[PDB]
């Protein structure tokens, strides 16, 4: 068995459970902690680990992609774990991973620098003034990952996707409401006033707190081990309020999923049910890096005695279980970008969260191209990402669109004219609204043609589904052509397509970008 778990978790402890499994069974267990494993997994899934550990939020995306086996615990095993933990790992009615532990961020503070932690975020600027006077700082935490800034953003009313009547509404995104703006503004104000630095990452903040340089950090239970070693006299407490409102962390359930392509699903099941998820197994991992509030009732009964676990659960209770839906990946990426751009000054808070709002709810789905009509822009076999276009929503000239052509087939072509546009071709020259428009994406085909012209003279008025009296494209209609104009079967053959046929726009990577 190959096992992947994040580098901040107790992977040495997990390896010890692995060694016990090997000693009992002969089956060798290799624990790896790759950089950005949560992103590597989908690439290698069909090659990677037999078991992947991550918080539950990533698993719906994995399952949606067919990368995970349904897990089959019996009633007796299920009863050993808290019911709410099984909720976190259920996607589309099916259990898709084993829950291990509940993780929530807490405020961690140095009792020698700060005997009373601040009740409110608002106090931090003044507190930092005092600490700077002795060459210290009030607060350092990972500004590079939105997980850590989320509690403050959500405090006064930010949310990811609205959960109502048993479902998440991915159209209802709460990334740019007043609460979110207020939280992110406060964060940016901290940075503007030098109470924090925009470049502070996980390792910088951890080193700072563990060396006694900063009075507070924000981190999860896995961080307590290193603090123990550092000998800092620390406390773990409730996050401060913002505008009177508790901070609201997104709560993760560390979970273990089984690769759908693993030839060792039965061995994985044995390892997780009978070695890891036992008092002994969890203790081995916990003693390495603390897990938080474990999913196994019998062991949690011991761990819940710890004041630090009480603080972890208290913060959890103010926050919310992360959604596990496939859209979660897009949400995190959008929020990460917003916080980075706001914190560095590239965008104002309003600009940043406006974009994040759009990006967080934008559905992206894979397609595979088949055929030559878009060559060389898209090639036969090419994998692409398609940004789903909302019903009756912003299609523009130049967008490459996927649309339903008939009951069986989706096609991909380029939008050359939108409703209201007057369009005609004179030879290979495109006229839109009386003005010649350059088509740089045809450059290669224009210069490697068999005939006199690749597109040829035609007018919209002559095409099926057009207004026979005008070159002005009717309401709800689109003119689409394939980039491989000499071979393409497109609007020239089948006429204008309707708005309700359109699925989405193909996203393109531009080859150039700044350094």
């Amino acid at each position: 068995l190959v096992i992947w778990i994040n580098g901040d978790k107790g992977y040495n402890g997990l390896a010890q459970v692995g060694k016990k499994f090997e000693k009992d069974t002969g089956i060798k267990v290799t624990v790896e902690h790759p950089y950005k494993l949560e992103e590597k997994f989908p690439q290698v899934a069909a090659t990677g680990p037999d078991i992947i550990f991550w918080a539950h939020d990533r698993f719906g995306g994995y399952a949606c992609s067919g990368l995970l086996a349904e897990i089959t615990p019996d009633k007796a095993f299920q009863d050993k774990l808290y019911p709410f933990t099984w909720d976190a790992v259920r996607y589309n009615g099916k259990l898709i991973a084993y829950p291990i532990a509940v993780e929530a961020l807490s405020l961690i503070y140095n009792k020698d620098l700060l005997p009373n932690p601040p009740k409110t975020w608002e106090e931090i600027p003044a507190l930092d003034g005092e600490l700077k006077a002795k060459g210290k700082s009030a607060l350092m935490f990972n500004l590079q990952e939105p997980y850590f800034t989320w509690p403050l953003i959500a405090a006064d009313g930010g949310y990811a996707f609205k959960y109502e009547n048993g479902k998440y509404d991915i159209k209802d995104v709460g990334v740019d409401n007043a609460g979110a703006k207020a939280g992110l503004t406060f964060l940016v104000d901290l940075i503007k006033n030098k109470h924090m630095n925009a470049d502070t990452d996980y390792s910088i903040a951890e080193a700072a707190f563990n060396k006694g340089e900063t009075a507070m950090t924000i981190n999860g239970p896995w961080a307590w081990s290193n603090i123990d070693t550092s000998k800092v006299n620390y406390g773990v407490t409730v996050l401060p309020t913002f505008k009177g409102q508790p901070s609201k962390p997104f709560v993760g359930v560390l979970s273990a999923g089984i690769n759908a392509a693993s030839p060792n699903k039965e061995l994985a099941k044995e390892f997780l049910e009978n070695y890891l998820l036992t008092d002994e197994g969890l203790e081995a991992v916990n003693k390495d890096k603390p897990l938080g509030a474990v999913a196994l009732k019998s062991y949690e009964e011991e761990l819940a005695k710890d004041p630090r676990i009480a603080a972890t659960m208290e913060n959890a209770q103010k926050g919310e279980i992360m959604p596990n839906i496939p859209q979660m990946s897009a949400f995190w990426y959008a929020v990460r970008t917003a916080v980075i751009n706001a914190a560095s000054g590239r965008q104002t808070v309003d600009e940043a969260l406006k974009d994040a709002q759009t990006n967080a709810g934008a559905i992206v789905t894979p397609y595979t191209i088949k055929g030559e009509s878009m060559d060389p822009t898209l090639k036969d076999g090419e994998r692409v990402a398609v940004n789903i276009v909302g019903y009756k929503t912003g299609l523009e000239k130049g967008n490459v669109v996927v649309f339903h052509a008939n009951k069986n087939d989706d096609y991909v072509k380029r939008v050359i004219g939108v409703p209201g546009d007057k369009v005609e071709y004179k030879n290979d020259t495109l006229y839109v609204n009386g003005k010649k428009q350059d088509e740089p994406y045809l450059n290669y085909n224009l210069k490697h043609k068999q005939g006199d012209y690749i597109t040829g003279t035609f007018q919209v008025k002559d095409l099926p589904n057009a207004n026979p009296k005008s070159n002005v494209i009717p309401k709800g209609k689109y003119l689409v052509l394939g980039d491989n104009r000499e071979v393409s079967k497109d609007s020239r053959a089948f006429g204008l397509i309707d708005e309700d046929q359109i699925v989405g726009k193909v996203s393109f990577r531009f080859w150039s970008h700044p350094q």
């Binding site: 397609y367 595979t368 055929g371 030559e372 009509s373 087939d409």
Partner: peptide, 14 residues
Amino acid sequence: GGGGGAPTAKAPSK
């Protein structure tokens, strides 16, 4: 989501 392989977008020739 469904767990199925990615859909196909045809780029049809005449």
